[PDB]
Design an enzyme around this catalytic site. Structure first.
Site, PDB file in Angstrom:
ATOM      1  N   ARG A   1       0.887  -1.147   0.000  1.00 25.04           N
ATOM      2  CA  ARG A   1       0.000   0.000   0.000  1.00 25.04           C
ATOM      3  C   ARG A   1       0.942   1.219   0.000  1.00 25.04           C
ATOM      4  O   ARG A   1       1.686   1.452   0.968  1.00 25.04           O
ATOM      5  CB  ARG A   1      -0.869  -0.004   1.240  1.00 25.04           C
ATOM      6  CG  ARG A   1      -2.006   1.029   1.191  1.00 25.04           C
ATOM      7  CD  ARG A   1      -1.675   2.511   1.304  1.00 25.04           C
ATOM      8  NE  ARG A   1      -1.093   2.738   2.603  1.00 25.04           N
ATOM      9  CZ  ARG A   1      -1.148   3.916   3.213  1.00 25.04           C
ATOM     10  NH1 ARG A   1      -1.729   4.949   2.647  1.00 25.04           N
ATOM     11  NH2 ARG A   1      -0.710   4.018   4.459  1.00 25.04           N
TER      12      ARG A   1
ATOM     13  N   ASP B   1       1.764   5.016   0.297  1.00 24.60           N
ATOM     14  CA  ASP B   1       1.321   6.243   0.903  1.00 24.60           C
ATOM     15  C   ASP B   1       1.591   7.472   0.015  1.00 24.60           C
ATOM     16  O   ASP B   1       2.601   7.518  -0.683  1.00 24.60           O
ATOM     17  CB  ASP B   1       2.045   6.353   2.269  1.00 24.60           C
ATOM     18  CG  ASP B   1       1.867   7.647   3.063  1.00 24.60           C
ATOM     19  OD1 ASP B   1       0.773   7.898   3.580  1.00 24.60           O
ATOM     20  OD2 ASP B   1       2.850   8.395   3.153  1.00 24.60           O
TER      21      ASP B   1
ATOM     22  N   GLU C   1      -3.018   5.464  -1.607  1.00 28.78           N
ATOM     23  CA  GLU C   1      -4.004   6.312  -0.976  1.00 28.78           C
ATOM     24  C   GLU C   1      -4.030   7.717  -1.594  1.00 28.78           C
ATOM     25  O   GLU C   1      -3.012   8.429  -1.560  1.00 28.78           O
ATOM     26  CB  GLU C   1      -3.722   6.419   0.520  1.00 28.78           C
ATOM     27  CG  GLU C   1      -4.717   7.378   1.175  1.00 28.78           C
ATOM     28  CD  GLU C   1      -4.753   7.478   2.685  1.00 28.78           C
ATOM     29  OE1 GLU C   1      -3.927   6.877   3.372  1.00 28.78           O
ATOM     30  OE2 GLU C   1      -5.655   8.149   3.177  1.00 28.78           O
TER      31      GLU C   1
ATOM     32  N   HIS D   1      -7.564   4.603   9.058  1.00 27.93           N
ATOM     33  CA  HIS D   1      -6.741   5.541   9.829  1.00 27.93           C
ATOM     34  C   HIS D   1      -6.865   7.032   9.518  1.00 27.93           C
ATOM     35  O   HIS D   1      -6.334   7.860  10.259  1.00 27.93           O
ATOM     36  CB  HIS D   1      -5.326   5.083   9.656  1.00 27.93           C
ATOM     37  CG  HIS D   1      -4.917   5.129   8.200  1.00 27.93           C
ATOM     38  ND1 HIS D   1      -5.360   4.429   7.159  1.00 27.93           N
ATOM     39  CD2 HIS D   1      -3.975   5.998   7.744  1.00 27.93           C
ATOM     40  CE1 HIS D   1      -4.731   4.842   6.100  1.00 27.93           C
ATOM     41  NE2 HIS D   1      -3.903   5.784   6.469  1.00 27.93           N
ATOM     42  N   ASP D   2      -7.508   7.380   8.396  1.00 25.72           N
ATOM     43  CA  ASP D   2      -7.672   8.768   8.023  1.00 25.72           C
ATOM     44  C   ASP D   2      -9.077   9.318   8.120  1.00 25.72           C
ATOM     45  O   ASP D   2      -9.409  10.368   7.567  1.00 25.72           O
ATOM     46  CB  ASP D   2      -7.120   8.949   6.600  1.00 25.72           C
ATOM     47  CG  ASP D   2      -5.592   9.094   6.606  1.00 25.72           C
ATOM     48  OD1 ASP D   2      -4.986   9.357   7.650  1.00 25.72           O
ATOM     49  OD2 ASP D   2      -4.970   8.932   5.574  1.00 25.72           O
TER      50      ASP D   2
END
Ligand SMILES: [Ca+2]
Ligand SMILES: [Ca+2]
Length: 686
Positions: free
Chosen positions: A227, A229, A257, A327-328
Site C-alpha cells: 500500500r 502512501d 491512498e 486511519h484517516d
C-alpha cells in the site's frame, strides 16, 4: 494454483483484508518495547508507542482470532526502521508508532521486531493462508528542519546502516528544498514538503535507485502486496517507473491512498487508478457508504448511482480496495450510533465489488474521532460480537462464490431506504437485501433475480434479521416483508462452462513477464490467450487450470491491448481491456523546455515515438507540464517514465482546447539511461 490460493500475489478480489496499526494490536514481545519517554504501556497517550508488534500478530493468527473471522490478508504498518526521536509538538510528545517516519528502508523497525520476526510473520501468515500487505511510504523520511540540524534526526536517510545524508547541508540534493506545501495545486503538493517531513527527491539517481532496490528487498522477503502512501504527492511519471520496477521483477498487488472528501469526484484520481499501474483505496465508495449508512446525508439512490458510475469510471473496478473507515477518518461506529448501522455497512462492503478492507477493531465496535483517536489499542479479542459473526459468515464467500469476488452489480429493487442488488458471474449469483430504516419494515413485491428455483437460506442465519428467499419460475421471488434493519444474503454457485475473466494482474509490464488471469471456465486443457490479435499458446502459457492462467506477455509493440481467453474447445471469453504492454524497462526523465510562452488555457505537452509518450498522438500527449515550483514559466517541466537504454524521438506542443501547435524544426532525439534518472533541458523551437 487456483485463483483463491494464498500464492496469488497479483489479485486480491477473493480476499478480505484486515488493516492493522501494528503498535495498537497486540504486544506479543515486551522486551522489544521502546523505553522512557517514547513508551506508554497504558496506551492512553495515543501518540506514543503502546508496544504492539509482529509477535502479537503471529499470536492472533495462531490462536484463531484472525482466521476464525475469515480474514485472508493483513495490512500492517510500514516495517522499515524509523527515527527514534520523541518530538514535542507544542507540549505533546510524538513518536514514530505509526511507521511513517522512515530513516532506513533496508532495515526493520525494532519495536515491531527483527528481520527474523518479519520472516516468521510471513511464514505464519502464509501457513494459515493469509497474505501480507505492507505500507511503503517513499515520499519522505521524517520531520526535519534544515535551519535547525538538531531537531529530530534531521530527516537523515541511511542505506542499511550507512548514512546517505541529512536535510541540513544536503549538498547531494537527496531532498527537496522548496518550502512546505499549501496544497493549492497538485504540482505544489508534489515538490513542496508535507508539513515538516523531509521530502525525498526522486530526480536524484541515488534516491531513485535506492528506493527501487529497497522495494525489491521486501518483495524478496515474500510480501504479497504494497500500500503506497501519499500517491498524490509524488510525480506520476516517477510512480509509473516504480510500478514498472515491481511488475517487471516480482508483480504483487499494489494500491495507493489518494484521499477524496464527501461528494468529491476527481478526474485525476480516476486517471491515476486507470494509468499508474496501481489501484486505489476506494474513497468514492467509502464516502458514499458513510453518507447512506452512517450520517444519513444521502439515500439508496445515491448508493445506486455510485455503484453504477464507479463500475464505468474505474477501468478495473475489481482491483479497488473498499472500506467504511480507516486511519484517516473518524471510526464509523459513534457513541450514540445504532450498532446495526455498522453491521449493515460491513455486510454491504464484504459482498460488494473490489477488495474489502476492515480496519482493526471494527468487530469490537471501537468509536473515536480523527487521528490519533481512531488508532486506540483494540480493547478486547472477543470472538462472540455480532460484528465478528457477520465477518465470519460473509468473508468466506469471497473465496467460494466468484460472483462476489468478480461479478457485476445490478440493482434489482430499491426505494429510499432499501436496496436489493445482485452480483453475477457466469451462472454464479449472490443477492443482498438491506433495509437501512431501523423503524419501518419494507414490503418487497416484484423482485426478480437470476437465482434458480429453490428456498434459499440467509447466509447470515437471520442474525441481522434476514429471512429465507423462495424463488419460483423465472427467478421471481415470492413476496416478503424485509424487517426494520434487515440484511440478508442469498447465493447460488455452479460451474462455468464458458471462459469468463474476472481479474488480471499485473496490468502493466514489459514482454516476457508472466501475468495472472483469474476467472472461471478456462478448462483443464491448455487453450489460447489473445493480446489483441496475437495468440499465445503452448510453452508461453506457464500454467492453465480452470480458475487461473499464468502466461508470458508476447513480444508485441508497446501500447494498450485487450486480453481474451479461448479454452481448448475454442469457446472465447469476455474481453478484459486496458492492458499496457511497456516498450521495456522504465526510467524517469525530467523534460524541461524554456521559452514556451502560452495564452490563457494553453498548456505545454510532450509526445514522441514510443507508447509511453503517446506514439505522436496529441490526444495522448504527456501533460500538461508544470511551471511553478522547480522551474517557473515560461520554463515548463515534467517527470516522465520512458523506456530505458534507447533513443526516443519527441517534440513538444502547446494545446488549447482543440488547437495543437507543434514546435518547429526537426524531431528531437535523446538516448535514455539504463537506470537512474536524466534531465533534458531544451528551448522551444518555433
Ligand atoms: Ca512489544
Ligand atoms: Ca513529494
Amino acid at each position: 494454483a487456483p485463483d483463491t490460493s494464498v500464492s496469488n500475489k497479483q489479485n486480491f478480489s477473493t480476499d478480505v483484508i484486515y488493516q492493522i496499526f501494528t503498535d495498537r494490536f497486540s504486544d506479543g514481545n515486551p522486551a522489544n518495547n521502546p523505553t522512557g519517554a517514547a513508551f506508554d504501556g497504558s496506551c492512553t497517550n495515543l501518540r506514543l508507542y503502546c508496544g504492539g508488534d509482529w509477535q502479537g500478530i503471529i499470536n492472533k493468527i495462531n490462536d484463531g482470532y484472525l482466521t476464525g473471522m475469515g480474514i485472508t490478508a493483513i495490512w500492517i504498518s510500514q516495517p522499515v526502521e524509523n527515527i527514534y526521536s520523541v518530538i514535542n509538538y507544542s507540549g505533546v510528545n510524538n513518536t514514530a508508532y505509526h511507521g511513517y517516519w522512515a530513516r532506513d528502508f533496508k532495515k526493520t523497525n525494532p519495536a515491531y521486531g527483527t528481520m527474523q520476526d518479519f520472516k516468521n510473520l510471513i511464514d505464519t501468515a502464509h501457513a494459515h493462508n493469509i497474505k501480507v500487505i505492507i505500507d511503503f511510504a517513499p515520499n519522505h523520511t521524517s520531520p526535519a528542519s534544515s535551519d535547525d540540524p538538531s531537531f529530530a534526526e534531521n530527516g537523515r536517510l541511511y542505506d542499511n546502516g550507512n548514512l546517505l545524508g541529512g536535510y541540513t547541508n544536503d549538498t547531494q540534493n537527496l531532498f527537496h528544498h522548496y518550502g512546505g506545501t499549501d496544497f493549492s495545486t497538485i504540482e505544489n503538493g508534489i515538490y513542496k514538503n508535507l508539513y515538516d517531513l523531509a521530502d525525498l527527491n526522486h530526480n536524484n539517481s541515488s534516491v531513485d535507485v535506492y528506493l527501487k532496490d529497497a522495494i525489491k528487498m521486501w518483495l524478496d522477503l515474500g510480501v504479497d502486496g504494497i500500500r503506497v502512501d501519499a500517491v498524490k504527492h509524488m510525480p506520476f511519471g516517477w510512480q509509473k517507473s516504480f510500478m514498472a520496477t515491481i511488475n517487471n521483477y516480482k508483480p504483487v498487488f499494489t494500491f495507493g491512498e489518494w484521499f477524496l472528501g464527501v461528494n468529491e469526484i476527481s478526474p485525476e484520481y480516476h486517471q491515476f487508478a486507470n494509468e499508474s499501474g496501481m489501484s486505489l483505496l476506494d474513497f468514492r465508495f467509502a464516502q458514499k457508504a458513510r453518507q447512506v449508512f452512517r450520517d444519513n446525508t444521502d439515500n439508496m439512490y445515491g448508493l445506486k448511482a455510485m455503484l453504477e458510475g464507479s463500475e464505468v469510471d474505474y477501468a478495473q473496478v475489481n482491483d479497488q480496495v473498499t472500506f467504511i473507515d480507516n486511519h484517516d477518518m473518524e471510526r464509523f461506529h459513534t457513541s450514540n450510533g445504532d450498532r446495526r448501522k455498522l453491521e449493515q455497512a460491513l455486510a454491504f462492503t464484504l459482498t460488494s465489488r473490489g477488495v474489502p478492507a476492515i480496519y482493526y477493531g471494527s468487530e469490537q465496535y471501537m468509536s473515536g474521532g480523527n487521528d490519533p483517536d481512531n488508532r486506540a489499542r483494540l480493547p478486547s479479542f472477543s470472538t462472540t460480537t455480532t460484528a465478528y459473526q457477520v465477518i465470519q459468515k460473509l468473508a468466506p464467500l469471497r473465496k467460494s462464490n466468484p460472483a462476489i469476488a468478480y461479478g457485476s452489480t445490478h440493482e434489482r429493487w430499491i426505494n429510499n431506504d432499501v436496496i436489493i442488488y445482485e452480483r453475477k458471474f457466469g451462472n454464479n449469483v449472490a443477492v443482498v437485501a438491506i433495509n437501512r430504516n431501523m423503524n419501518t419494515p419494507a414490503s418487497i413485491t416484484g423482485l426478480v433475480t437470476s437465482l434458480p428455483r429453490g428456498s434459499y437460506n440467509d447466509v447470515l442465519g437471520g442474525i441481522l434479521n434476514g429471512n429465507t428467499l423462495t424463488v419460483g419460475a423465472g427467478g421471481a421471488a415470492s413476496n416478503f416483508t424485509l424487517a426494520p434493519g434487515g440484511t440478508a444474503v442469498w447465493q447460488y454457485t455452479t460451474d462455468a462452462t464458458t471462459p469468463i475473466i474476472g481479474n488480471v494482474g499485473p496490468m502493466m509490464a514489459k514482454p516476457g513477464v508472466t501475468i495472472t488471469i483469474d476467472g472461471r471456465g478456462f478448462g483443464s486443457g491448455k487453450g489460447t490467450v489473445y493480446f489483441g490479435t496475437t495468440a499465445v499458446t503452448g510453452a508461453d502459457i506457464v500454467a492453465w487450470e480452470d480458475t487461473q492462467i499464468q502466461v508470458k506477455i508476447p513480444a508485441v509493440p508497446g501500447g494498450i491491448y485487450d486480453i481474451r481467453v479461448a479454452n481448448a474447445a475454442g469457446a472465447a471469453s469476455n474481453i478484459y481491456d486496458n492492458f499496457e504492454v511497456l516498450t521495456g524497462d522504465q526510467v524517469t526523465v525530467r523534460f524541461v523546455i524554456n521559452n514556451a510562452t502560452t495564452a490563457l488555457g494553453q498548456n505545454v505537452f510532450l509526445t514522441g515515438n514510443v507508447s509511453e509518450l503517446g506514439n505522436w498522438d496529441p490526444n495522448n500527449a504527456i501533460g500538461p507540464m508544470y511551471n511553478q515550483v522547480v522551474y517557473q514559466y515560461p520554463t515548463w517541466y515534467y517527470d516522465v517514465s520512458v523506456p530505458a537504454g534507447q533513443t526516443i524521438e519527441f517534440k513538444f506542443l502547446k494545446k488549447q482546447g482543440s488547437t495543437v501547435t507543434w514546435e518547429g524544426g526537426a524531431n528531437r532525439t535523446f538516448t535514455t539511461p539504463t537506470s537512474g534518472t536524466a534531465t533534458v533541458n531544451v528551448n522551444w523551437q518555433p
